[PDB]
Design a protein around this ligand. Sequence first.
Ligand SMILES: *Cc1c(COP(=O)(O)O)cnc(C)c1O
Ligand SMILES: *Cc1c(COP(=O)(O)O)cnc(C)c1O
Lengths: 366, 356
Amino acid sequence: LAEAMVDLGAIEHNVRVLREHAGHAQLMAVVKADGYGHGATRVAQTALGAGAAELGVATVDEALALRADGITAPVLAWLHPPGIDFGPALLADVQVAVSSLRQLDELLHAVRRTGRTATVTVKVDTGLNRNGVGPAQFPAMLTALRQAMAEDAVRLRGLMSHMPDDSINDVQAQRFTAFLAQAREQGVRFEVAHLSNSSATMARPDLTFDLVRPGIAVYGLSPVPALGDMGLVPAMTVKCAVALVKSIRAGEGVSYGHTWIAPRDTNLALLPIGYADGVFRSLGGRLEVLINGRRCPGVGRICMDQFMVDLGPGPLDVAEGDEAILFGPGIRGEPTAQDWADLVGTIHYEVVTSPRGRITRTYREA
Amino acid sequence: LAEAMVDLGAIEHNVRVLREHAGHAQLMAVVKADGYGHGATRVAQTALGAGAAELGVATVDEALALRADGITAPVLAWLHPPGIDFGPALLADVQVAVSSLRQLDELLHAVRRTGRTATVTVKVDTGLNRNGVGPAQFPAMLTALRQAMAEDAVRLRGLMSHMVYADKPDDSINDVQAQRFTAFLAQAREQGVRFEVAHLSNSSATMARPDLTFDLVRPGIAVYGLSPVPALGDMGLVPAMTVKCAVALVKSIRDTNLALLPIGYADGVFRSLGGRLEVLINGRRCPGVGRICMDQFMVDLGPGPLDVAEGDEAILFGPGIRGEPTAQDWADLVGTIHYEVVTSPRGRITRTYREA
Ligand SMILES: *Cc1c(COP(=O)(O)O)cnc(C)c1O
Ligand SMILES: *Cc1c(COP(=O)(O)O)cnc(C)c1O
């Protein structure tokens, strides 16, 4: 019907490029939100197979699904509900990042229930101000960790914070540096530090610490759009089969509300996916699809489960069953996720986490 | 962490309301797209319990899921990709709407291979200009349907078509489509063919143009309690879906406090709502601040003594009883319609049910 084809060969490519940019630092591939819509387990397997060292996700739930799928590499999780029981994480060897004193108390309580040493990371706030430990709270946090470490309740794995040439990076980096120094000055030692997302990894190599945590560039989407594709290959191609071809006459309206009235006799193609499958309704009359090497603009509203495109009045070169490409890396001239983002007024992150319903996720091996 | 809670009590209500409007017309509850994101199977069971006569879906796949879920009531599917195997539909007592001769020929091949008579409906074009047979091709279709009927390959169940407007009941195209539909009924007659039922109505036509009702109505959006003509108000319906999550964190920052809600655009929280939406927390509206992130966003609780605690419920949208925003409200802010809003929740927003 429709598919979101994920090319694990591009994933492999993207991780290799990130590894080169990260230089000496190891790579934590970020596979939260089911691999940014690309499949967390499959992308994790491929990224690890191409040399990433660790995996990063938001929730402990995300981490356990990777484990139930047989993933054995290190996994870190950093976004936790209040009151969470950290037990299952400790038992399944999931690393936990804490962003407050209460959360460390929650974690130490589970260490006591399970008898399982926690591999902890502290998430500090460097101007971000959503969550993370503040400079004011950091001394108390350090004192607790030192005591926890002394009895082997925790392993002090990491310090982390979250963000190109804007000064605001330099300051955040400095502030990050001060946290490392305070820790240093109070005799608390972390095995690694990391502050770099995809953008910082690729555009600000001077700010890379021991690890980098790229998400968006692993899927080959550009971490700084204005700069171009930065050598990455977008891994997702969303496409579907043409369900019908029909000619229509000038002056005829198409689809709900007849917001489009043909200015001339033309051929149309019905594509059988719509906004319930993740084709943003705001794309109506704005997107273009690629069919047999040609761009075809959407005409009329996007419906719940279908929309039409105009093939033009030229010699008909489309048949039922042919392939229409909605977005992809662009290599065949098809539109990109960035193109949709521009049309809709959003970011490619939201575009690749949109496909669903009848768009089936499929993979091309590397 | 978050849920899309579907009140099956509202469903039931909405369906009785629709039955009142449908009068003697039989009701086909439309449950395509997994019941408009509300859950096809559970919504179908409730609707049939509320008096719906039949179910409508877009694809045979959707119909087969209802069958696999124990539904035995009549189900009609009307959008079929090229290459579809109609065999499994026939074997599962799924009705098939065909919109071309080629589709009927495919269906007749399937009839011969399975040994099962097809219960067919013909989808005709009365104005949408999408997928329906057009008047010039209808005679050849009628002829093929008569020969098959005579030879017991098919049961001639319905004639159907779809309205160009989903929400403007008094535009004259509505009237025009209904007269085009009658003309198709005229053609059938002249070809010595009759259909058991004819249907053209969606939620809007059902509730606001009952003069245009034929034998059957096909309401979708109204079953879920969403207004088919938003300008007229809630039209006596009750939106069945409530989306909410817990406050994950409270944060002191003029001087004020923020709540972190741990769902974002990957969960279906449209990114363009950022800095525009409001949530309901302890009976007060709390405006979003900053951008919606992929898996979280912030809202302003205001300054002073806190009335809000981590773990408290935040309502993103619902019927509006408790003063929470509505799906229509999100639609107004995003520039869309509530249909797209209710098919948006996913990822960590878990669908739940309240029994009626
Ligand atoms: C989402 C996320 C990342 C990945 O960021 P990108 O911009 O996708 O590279 C890294 N670290 C944290 C804490 C994140 O939440
Ligand atoms: C979607 C659909 C409906 C439901 O329309 P509403 O506007 O939701 O009431 C009815 N009939 C067909 C053929 C449909 O595709």
